[PDB]
Design a protein around this motif. Structure first.
Motif, PDB file in Angstrom:
ATOM      1  N   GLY A  15       0.954  -1.267  -0.115  1.00  0.00           N
ATOM      2  CA  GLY A  15       0.043   0.112  -0.053  1.00  0.00           C
ATOM      3  C   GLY A  15       1.072   1.170   0.176  1.00  0.00           C
ATOM      4  O   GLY A  15       2.113   1.110  -0.241  1.00  0.00           O
ATOM      5  N   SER A  16       0.025   2.220  -0.076  1.00  0.00           N
ATOM      6  CA  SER A  16       0.895   3.838   0.130  1.00  0.00           C
ATOM      7  C   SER A  16       1.733   3.891   1.259  1.00  0.00           C
ATOM      8  O   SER A  16       2.761   4.609   1.256  1.00  0.00           O
ATOM      9  CB  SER A  16      -0.180   4.854  -0.093  1.00  0.00           C
ATOM     10  N   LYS A  17       1.497   3.168   2.085  1.00  0.00           N
ATOM     11  CA  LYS A  17       2.422   3.302   3.424  1.00  0.00           C
ATOM     12  C   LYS A  17       4.067   2.843   3.305  1.00  0.00           C
ATOM     13  O   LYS A  17       4.913   3.331   3.590  1.00  0.00           O
ATOM     14  CB  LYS A  17       2.020   2.461   4.500  1.00  0.00           C
ATOM     15  N   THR A  18       4.058   1.483   2.257  1.00  0.00           N
ATOM     16  CA  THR A  18       5.194   1.019   2.243  1.00  0.00           C
ATOM     17  C   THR A  18       6.296   1.851   1.198  1.00  0.00           C
ATOM     18  O   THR A  18       7.475   1.891   1.612  1.00  0.00           O
ATOM     19  CB  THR A  18       5.170  -0.275   1.826  1.00  0.00           C
ATOM     20  N   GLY A  19       5.978   1.822   0.136  1.00  0.00           N
ATOM     21  CA  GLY A  19       6.766   2.658  -1.028  1.00  0.00           C
ATOM     22  C   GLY A  19       7.005   3.891  -0.837  1.00  0.00           C
ATOM     23  O   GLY A  19       6.644   4.687  -0.134  1.00  0.00           O
ATOM     24  N   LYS A  20       7.826   4.453  -2.006  1.00  0.00           N
ATOM     25  CA  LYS A  20       7.862   5.757  -2.139  1.00  0.00           C
ATOM     26  C   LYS A  20       6.332   6.410  -2.370  1.00  0.00           C
ATOM     27  O   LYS A  20       5.555   5.872  -2.914  1.00  0.00           O
ATOM     28  CB  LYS A  20       8.687   6.194  -3.432  1.00  0.00           C
ATOM     29  N   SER A  21       6.339   7.598  -1.795  1.00  0.00           N
ATOM     30  CA  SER A  21       4.826   8.102  -1.650  1.00  0.00           C
ATOM     31  C   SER A  21       4.229   8.098  -3.276  1.00  0.00           C
ATOM     32  O   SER A  21       4.689   8.780  -4.343  1.00  0.00           O
ATOM     33  CB  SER A  21       4.923   9.757  -1.388  1.00  0.00           C
ATOM     34  N   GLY A  22       3.021   7.334  -3.206  1.00  0.00           N
ATOM     35  CA  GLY A  22       2.348   7.404  -4.493  1.00  0.00           C
ATOM     36  C   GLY A  22       2.598   6.157  -5.379  1.00  0.00           C
ATOM     37  O   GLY A  22       1.956   5.935  -6.441  1.00  0.00           O
ATOM     38  N   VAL A  23       3.689   5.430  -5.101  1.00  0.00           N
ATOM     39  CA  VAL A  23       3.858   4.294  -5.929  1.00  0.00           C
ATOM     40  C   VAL A  23       2.885   3.319  -5.945  1.00  0.00           C
ATOM     41  O   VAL A  23       2.624   2.540  -6.812  1.00  0.00           O
ATOM     42  CB  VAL A  23       5.273   3.679  -5.410  1.00  0.00           C
TER      43      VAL A  23
ATOM     44  N   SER B 153       9.996 -15.365  -0.015  1.00  0.00           N
ATOM     45  CA  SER B 153      10.063 -14.262   0.661  1.00  0.00           C
ATOM     46  C   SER B 153      10.690 -13.267   0.058  1.00  0.00           C
ATOM     47  O   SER B 153      11.914 -13.342  -0.706  1.00  0.00           O
ATOM     48  CB  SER B 153      10.823 -14.722   2.069  1.00  0.00           C
ATOM     49  N   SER B 154      10.241 -11.994   0.134  1.00  0.00           N
ATOM     50  CA  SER B 154      10.781 -10.885  -0.521  1.00  0.00           C
ATOM     51  C   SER B 154      12.391 -10.644  -0.011  1.00  0.00           C
ATOM     52  O   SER B 154      12.538 -10.512   1.158  1.00  0.00           O
ATOM     53  CB  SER B 154      10.331  -9.426  -0.500  1.00  0.00           C
ATOM     54  N   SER B 155      13.540 -10.421  -0.755  1.00  0.00           N
ATOM     55  CA  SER B 155      14.721 -10.334  -0.380  1.00  0.00           C
ATOM     56  C   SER B 155      14.930  -8.990   0.206  1.00  0.00           C
ATOM     57  O   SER B 155      15.753  -8.605   1.118  1.00  0.00           O
ATOM     58  CB  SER B 155      15.903 -10.539  -1.711  1.00  0.00           C
ATOM     59  N   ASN B 156      14.253  -7.887  -0.440  1.00  0.00           N
ATOM     60  CA  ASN B 156      14.534  -6.686  -0.050  1.00  0.00           C
ATOM     61  C   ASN B 156      13.183  -5.706   0.336  1.00  0.00           C
ATOM     62  O   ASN B 156      13.009  -4.959  -0.370  1.00  0.00           O
ATOM     63  CB  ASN B 156      15.459  -5.799  -1.034  1.00  0.00           C
ATOM     64  N   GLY B 157      12.316  -6.449   1.012  1.00  0.00           N
ATOM     65  CA  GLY B 157      11.158  -6.110   1.393  1.00  0.00           C
ATOM     66  C   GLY B 157      11.286  -4.534   2.060  1.00  0.00           C
ATOM     67  O   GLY B 157      12.176  -4.489   2.910  1.00  0.00           O
ATOM     68  N   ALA B 158      10.329  -3.748   1.981  1.00  0.00           N
ATOM     69  CA  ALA B 158      10.365  -2.273   2.492  1.00  0.00           C
ATOM     70  C   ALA B 158      10.628  -2.538   3.949  1.00  0.00           C
ATOM     71  O   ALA B 158      11.169  -1.619   4.805  1.00  0.00           O
ATOM     72  CB  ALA B 158       9.670  -1.157   1.982  1.00  0.00           C
ATOM     73  N   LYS B 159       9.584  -3.378   4.753  1.00  0.00           N
ATOM     74  CA  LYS B 159       9.507  -3.673   6.293  1.00  0.00           C
ATOM     75  C   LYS B 159       9.430  -2.329   7.016  1.00  0.00           C
ATOM     76  O   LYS B 159      10.156  -1.740   7.737  1.00  0.00           O
ATOM     77  CB  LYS B 159      10.752  -4.293   6.693  1.00  0.00           C
TER      78      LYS B 159
ATOM     79  N   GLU C 266      10.989   2.943 -11.081  1.00  0.00           N
ATOM     80  CA  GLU C 266      10.552   2.743  -9.511  1.00  0.00           C
ATOM     81  C   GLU C 266       9.384   1.869  -9.320  1.00  0.00           C
ATOM     82  O   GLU C 266       9.562   0.942  -8.236  1.00  0.00           O
ATOM     83  CB  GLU C 266      10.575   4.025  -9.006  1.00  0.00           C
ATOM     84  N   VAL C 267       8.511   2.003  -9.982  1.00  0.00           N
ATOM     85  CA  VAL C 267       7.237   1.053  -9.881  1.00  0.00           C
ATOM     86  C   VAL C 267       7.469  -0.461 -10.508  1.00  0.00           C
ATOM     87  O   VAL C 267       7.370  -1.382  -9.447  1.00  0.00           O
ATOM     88  CB  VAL C 267       6.270   1.606 -10.950  1.00  0.00           C
ATOM     89  N   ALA C 268       8.215  -0.667 -11.283  1.00  0.00           N
ATOM     90  CA  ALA C 268       8.748  -1.959 -11.690  1.00  0.00           C
ATOM     91  C   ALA C 268       9.448  -2.705 -10.630  1.00  0.00           C
ATOM     92  O   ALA C 268       9.277  -3.698 -10.322  1.00  0.00           O
ATOM     93  CB  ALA C 268       9.341  -1.955 -12.731  1.00  0.00           C
ATOM     94  N   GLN C 269      10.515  -1.903  -9.739  1.00  0.00           N
ATOM     95  CA  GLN C 269      11.283  -2.277  -8.689  1.00  0.00           C
ATOM     96  C   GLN C 269      10.474  -2.409  -7.436  1.00  0.00           C
ATOM     97  O   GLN C 269      11.084  -3.028  -6.415  1.00  0.00           O
ATOM     98  CB  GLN C 269      12.292  -1.558  -8.616  1.00  0.00           C
ATOM     99  N   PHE C 270       9.335  -1.655  -7.311  1.00  0.00           N
ATOM    100  CA  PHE C 270       8.541  -1.817  -6.103  1.00  0.00           C
ATOM    101  C   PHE C 270       7.450  -2.900  -6.396  1.00  0.00           C
ATOM    102  O   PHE C 270       6.967  -3.431  -5.372  1.00  0.00           O
ATOM    103  CB  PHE C 270       7.594  -0.586  -5.961  1.00  0.00           C
ATOM    104  N   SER C 271       7.164  -3.427  -7.572  1.00  0.00           N
ATOM    105  CA  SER C 271       6.390  -4.644  -7.778  1.00  0.00           C
ATOM    106  C   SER C 271       7.200  -5.734  -7.408  1.00  0.00           C
ATOM    107  O   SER C 271       6.872  -6.698  -6.685  1.00  0.00           O
ATOM    108  CB  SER C 271       5.857  -4.772  -9.202  1.00  0.00           C
TER     109      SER C 271
END
Lengths: 122, 364, 417, 41, 364, 122
Positions: free
Chosen positions: B29-37, B202-208, B161-166
């Motif tokens: 959701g909007s909480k995790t990634g860069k604002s708006g991704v 499991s995501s290797s580099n999840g935002a956490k 950025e969107v592709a790498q956030f997916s």
């Protein structure tokens, strides 16, 4: 008129067989060189007929740097035609620079159009 | 049930002959990634796939009578689908091809996702209540939950950025499939034979996302044309979701349109408890003319406090009703309504519109 | 569990009891909407229902359902509290006259007038509300469901008390319910608490369709809002679902939606060649015996209203000719999903079951509706198109930036070629 | 919305699909008379 | 000198053969009236008169080679004019007919004062630094000095409000005429025989702005496209104007464009002490790319504090220079630069632009 | 063609003298009544030739309520002329409602234009 997809399909139809590739590819290279468009600063994709909704869509979908380079190439070709002069071999578009940059976008647009036609025809 | 990827699958029967299947990406959701991704990703999610193009999938879905939607929430990215029970093996497969091997083509970023995202942002922010709520989240939760729910030009987003956030999201642990009107065994089989089983375990580099770190007492003001609004926001721990829910049902809430409630007696006023995994936000909002809103928000404040516990008790059943109504499959809630006292002294305040008329926090 | 129960008096308790329902609701309905009003007393049905729905509830959510034809109060509660909700409304109804007699309508009238004005402010509701009236000008069906400011201001307790005594009668009232509860327990609870006066079912006031155009040209608005529709099949009509199927053929559209460029309806692809329309919505509104079939459209460009009406109406012509099997298969599926979507919420089904039990006397579950829609062939749609669309009179409504909307003759002529 | 003007007197007495059929008849008659006159000229 | 209306008149010689005559309406600025009425009035002030229409006055002024301008400041509404010494009796008379008997015609409100005001507001707010400064004033002073300097649609203004704000303002006590390159006796005579002597001696219902009531510690954030900015604002009493001025001149200021200053070493950074009658605001601003600004503002903060008093001493002369440069006739200043220490712990903070990157107040 | 300022000046030139006012004013009232525009729902100002930059400017500066009333009056007049029917005396524009609402704006526009011409001609 001919869909870019059709010509690409025919070209791959030929290229898959060295029996015909070894015969035509040299002829194709010579014919492109003799076509005379390279000496004017134009790549093959610049010659393509833009006035077609598929083609206009493909150009609109083109990256900024490629679009600007294409604009400069077209302007240079127009200036050379107007001045009745040609670039020397040094400044001419080298054969390796004919990268067919616009073909992927045109093929994507053609695939979208064909999918639309196929889906609405059922 | 779950597959080796640790994907959680829940399925239960529905009243109608309508399978409602939703994929909840836990922290996309909007909480995790860069604002708006998250919003832009919600736009991409159905727009292409390795298996199917946008046009083919949309045409086939409409031929099938189903509906597919992608809504972004601060917690999770929700991919809703509603189709006849007959069409489950199709849509689940589609959702697989949506979670993985989504194309993310630039010609879609520039044509169908930036214009659409900007149009949705303008349409939503046109309502002063929503703009005030977004600002109230931004000030109450400084990062994470405070990120705006929608993409804004003030934070440019590049397709990469969107592709790498997916990727590095959309991991098996990080998604949950929830189905109403579908047998759990059949859905599990379809998911197992779908693309979901190709997801990273499991995501290797999840935002956490970092802890919520609620900030209380802050106030903001957002000048805006047209209708004005005034909102009061109380950050809340999850364990208090019950209390405030009851309080909301006591004074009146958007989820329960009903006159005769204490808050409904003042025009344009409504309350609502936004609920999230680790934090919540109780919001009392008034909207309309600035002069009216100025006194309406003060009356709403005076109503939220001074509410008698005896009167609060009757609100317990209404709060249970509100939780059940909000329990829609995409956002399941387990909230124990308690009816205990709910403090309001720690309010944040945000005003939108004719800032000359609307009051300041020191006036409550 | 659609089973019905008839009390010692003629009141019928219809309950769509169903396990796995998230929440349960009960509502008492009497078939008196704006249909059964007249201009002097317009909006009394809404006002009297709002007063009843404004009564204190024992933790239940009383809400008022107001419609052209039927009107009633609905209580929503958790499944375990349904019996209390049932006993509540019976208390509300049995004490309806007593409540209204002492009730001060000033505050309620302000709320109702505020609602009506808010309906006028919203362009879609204004266009649709005007559209329904223009089609039925001269009859009671033309009256707004919530009334009008000037009409409401003249309402008095005597007007409503006369209204309730005329309409709130055993033969003109139904009780609806839905959720996870025992039907018998609810019925027994109602019988022990509901006491209403007997009366004959008021004859439903007739209404007839009259093709007309009502233009509210409003040049200060940012977009042009228009709706065009014909005399569509209403309830208790064999084509009721067929009309819905025809509407779904053209479906919905929203230019700023991710699905716009990829949606099936032909009109959607056509309008994007110029971004003619921002949003349009095809619908089949159905009343007790009359229905309106057409579309609502919002155009964000002053210069493309005539282009849209031309193309949209040209697309209507394809109902009677060259309609594709794929479209009918799509429309059948889309309607079936839309039909099932409406009945998800227990509140929505409670309203629906009350509507059918009043206006048609019987109800069809989704099983029967799916069996009917599935049997709709392409020919049946084409015959319907010729009957109800081809060269049939249209009713036109429009409020914003209407200047480009060509007059009635032009639009109506597009309905045939 | 509001009270429409009363058109009762202006309304036609004839059937919904019948009056348009008669309109078709006379418009086509005008068209074919014009065609006959143009043919003669 | 003064006339019976208590109008203050000050005149002193100028270097050039250029009379600069300004009328400073003491409390007709954006602080006094409804938000923005001062800006709209500044637009109206020259757009008609009882004595002369706008066209005739503008044409005659340009024929005379003079320039006329109306600038709105938070304290006062200034009417500047610059003309050859020969043309004094004209312009003063004009200003009389400007202060009184201004027509206030609606055909000008809708044509020349709303479009112009909106264009100026958009042009100014396009600069993130100015938007940040306006927000910083709004949060540091909640009312009065916090009122936006320009008209905004969020606070609709009706022509009658502007007309009623011209009256009950523009009183003899409430205006001061200041002239460079004009003899005080001649200017006094012209003013006495001009329209000024018809002004009310004292406004019957003057706004009488309430005490400043500086609020410190507040922070705000204004999402915006394009260039980002970050500003830090310290409210200051008038008696402190000296100290902070020196501090500003010590670190670098907009009034003194000069590299080698501590603040100039970080791109896009500048400091300035906004001075008003009863309060002031020391502002440290950084503008540019969001990523650069994020660290630039922290460096600017670290520079504002930790500045050595010995180094601060040399800045006294630069502060005197800055005060003299800002001593322009329209805004005269009497500031005793003293070089004492200036605290910064009480800062307000406002960020504009890419709010995702820009820091929060807790990060300084 | 004739400037509204000139006609207003002539009308005031006459009205300032009862010797001519007492003679012409009754005649003017009878002429306006017989002009037949009132029975169509129009006021005198509605008849003024809009297609002139001064007239267009004057109309644009008209208040909202007056502008909407004028639009309705013009539409009613067009409908009446189209239907070849006239309002009865009850619905006709009474003489006292010919308020000359548009004259002040036209005169303001004319004064602005005349000031411009006079100033730029020196």
């Amino acid at each position: 008129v001919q869909s870019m997809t059709s010509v690409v399909k025919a070209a791959n139809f030929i290229l898959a067989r060295p029996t015909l590739s070894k015969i035509i590819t040299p002829l194709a290279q010579k014919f492109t060189a003799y076509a005379g468009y390279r000496e004017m600063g134009l790549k093959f994709n610049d010659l393509l007929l833009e006035e077609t909704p598929i083609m206009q869509t493909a150009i609109k979908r083109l990256p900024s740097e490629l679009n600007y380079s294409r604009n400069f190439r077209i302007l240079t070709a127009h200036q050379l035609a107007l001045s009745h002069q040609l670039l020397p071999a040094e400044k001419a578009v080298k054969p390796e620079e004919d990268d067919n940059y616009l073909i992927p976008y045109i093929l994507e647009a053609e695939k979208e159009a064909f999918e639309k036609a196929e889906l609405d025809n059922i | 049930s779950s597959i080796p990827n640790s994907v959680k699958i829940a399925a239960k029967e529905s009243a109608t002959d309508l399978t409602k299947l939703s994929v909840i990406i836990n922290n996309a959701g909007s909480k995790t990634g860069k604002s708006g991704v998250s919003h832009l990703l919600s736009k991409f999610t159905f727009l292409n796939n390795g298996a199917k193009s946008a046009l083919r999938f949309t045409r086939e879905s409409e031929l099938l009578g189903g509906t597919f939607e992608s809504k972004v929430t601060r917690d999770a990215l929700i991919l809703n689908t509603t189709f006849l029970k007959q069409d489950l093996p199709y849509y689940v497969e589609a959702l697989g091809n949506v979670v993985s091997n989504t194309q993310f083509a630039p010609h879609e970023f520039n044509e169908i996702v930036l214009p659409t995202a900007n149009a949705e942002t303008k349409l939503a922010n046109a309502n002063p209540a929503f703009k005030g709520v977004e600002k109230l989240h931004e000030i109450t939760f400084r990062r994470g939950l405070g990120n705006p729910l929608f993409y804004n030009e003030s934070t440019p987003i590049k397709l990469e950025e969107v592709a790498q956030f997916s990727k590095e999201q959309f991991s098996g642990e990080n998604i949950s499939i929830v189905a109403e009107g579908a047998n759990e065994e059949d859905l599990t089989k379809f998911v197992s034979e779908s693309a979901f089983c190709y997801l990273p375990s499991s995501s290797s580099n999840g935002a956490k996302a970092l802890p919520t770190n609620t900030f209380t007492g802050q106030e903001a003001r957002v000048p805006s044309s047209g209708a004005s609004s005034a909102l009061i926001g109380i950050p809340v721990k999850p364990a208090d979701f019950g209390k405030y829910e009851v309080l909301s049902a006591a004074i009146g809430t958007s989820t329960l349109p009903s006159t005769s409630t204490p808050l409904a007696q003042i025009p344009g006023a409504t309350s609502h408890l936004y609920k999230y995994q680790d934090a919540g936000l109780f919001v009392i909002s008034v909207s309309g003319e600035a002069s009216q809103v100025a006194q309406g928000i003060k009356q709403a404040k005076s109503v939220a406090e001074s509410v008698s516990s005896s009167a609060l008790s009757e609100a317990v059943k209404a709060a249970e009703l509100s939780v059940a109504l909000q329990s829609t499959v995409d956002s399941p809630l387990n909230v124990k309504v308690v009816a205990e006292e709910a403090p309001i002294s720690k309010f944040n305040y945000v005003a939108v519109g004719d800032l000359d008329v609307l009051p300041y926090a020191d006036e409550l | 569990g659609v089973k019905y129960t008839t009390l010692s008096n003629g009141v019928t308790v219809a309950t769509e009891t169903n396990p796995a329902a998230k929440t349960s609701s009960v509502g008492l309905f009497f078939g008196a909407g704006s249909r059964s009003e007249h201009s002097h007393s317009n909006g009394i049905s809404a006002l009297t229902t709002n007063v009843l729905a404004s009564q204190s509830a024992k933790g239940s959510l009383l809400t008022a359902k107001n419609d052209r034809e039927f009107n009633g109060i609905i209580a929503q509660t958790t499944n375990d509290n349904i019996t209390e909700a049932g006993k509540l409304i019976a208390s509300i109804a049995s004490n309806a006259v007593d409540i209204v007699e002492k009730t001060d309508l000033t505050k309620h009238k302000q709320y109702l007038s505020a609602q009506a004005s808010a309906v006028e402010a919203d362009p879609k509701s204004k266009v649709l509300s005007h559209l329904y009236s223009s089609a039925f000008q001269g009859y009671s069906l033309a009256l707004p469901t919530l009334g009008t400011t000037e009409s409401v201001e003249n309402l008095e307790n005597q007007d409503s008390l006369r209204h309730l005594a005329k309409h709130l009668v055993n033969n003109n009232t139904v009780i609806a319910a839905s959720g996870n509860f025992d039907h018998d327990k609810l019925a027994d609870a109602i019988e022990a608490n509901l006491k209403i006066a007997e009366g004959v079912k008021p004859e439903i006031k007739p209404a007839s369709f009259l093709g007309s155009e009502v233009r509210m040209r409003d040049d200060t608005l940012p977009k042009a809002y228009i709706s065009i529709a014909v005399h569509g099949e209403g309830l208790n009509s064999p084509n009721y679902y067929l009309a819905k199927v025809a509407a779904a053929i053209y479906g919905d559209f929203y230019l700023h939606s991710t699905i716009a460029k990829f949606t099936s309806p032909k009109l959607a692809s056509i309008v994007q060649e110029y971004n003619i329309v921002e949003s349009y919505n095809h619908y089949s509104k159905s009343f007790s015996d009359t229905g309106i079939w057409g579309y609502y459209a919002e155009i964000a460009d002053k210069f493309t209203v005539d282009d849209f009406t031309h193309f949209s109406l040209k697309e209507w012509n394809r109902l009677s000719i060259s309609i594709s099997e794929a479209e009918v298969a799509r429309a059948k599926a889309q309607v079936k999903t839309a039909l099932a979507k409406e009945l998800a919420n227990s509140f929505a089904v409670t309203s629906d079951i009350a509507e059918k039990v009043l206006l048609v006397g019987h109800r069809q579950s989704l099983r029967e509706a799916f069996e009917k829609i599935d049997a709709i062939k392409v020919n049946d749609v084409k015959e319907w198109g010729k009957s109800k669309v081809w060269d049939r009179d249209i009713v036109i409504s429009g409020t914003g930036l209407i200047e480009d909307l060509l007059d009635y003759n032009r639009n109506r002529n597009e309905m045939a070629m | 919305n509001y009270q429409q003007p009363d058109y009762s007197s202006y309304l036609n007495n004839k059937s919904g699909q019948g009056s348009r059929n008669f309109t078709y008849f006379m418009v086509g008659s005008m068209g074919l008379l014009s065609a006959a006159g143009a043919k003669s000229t």
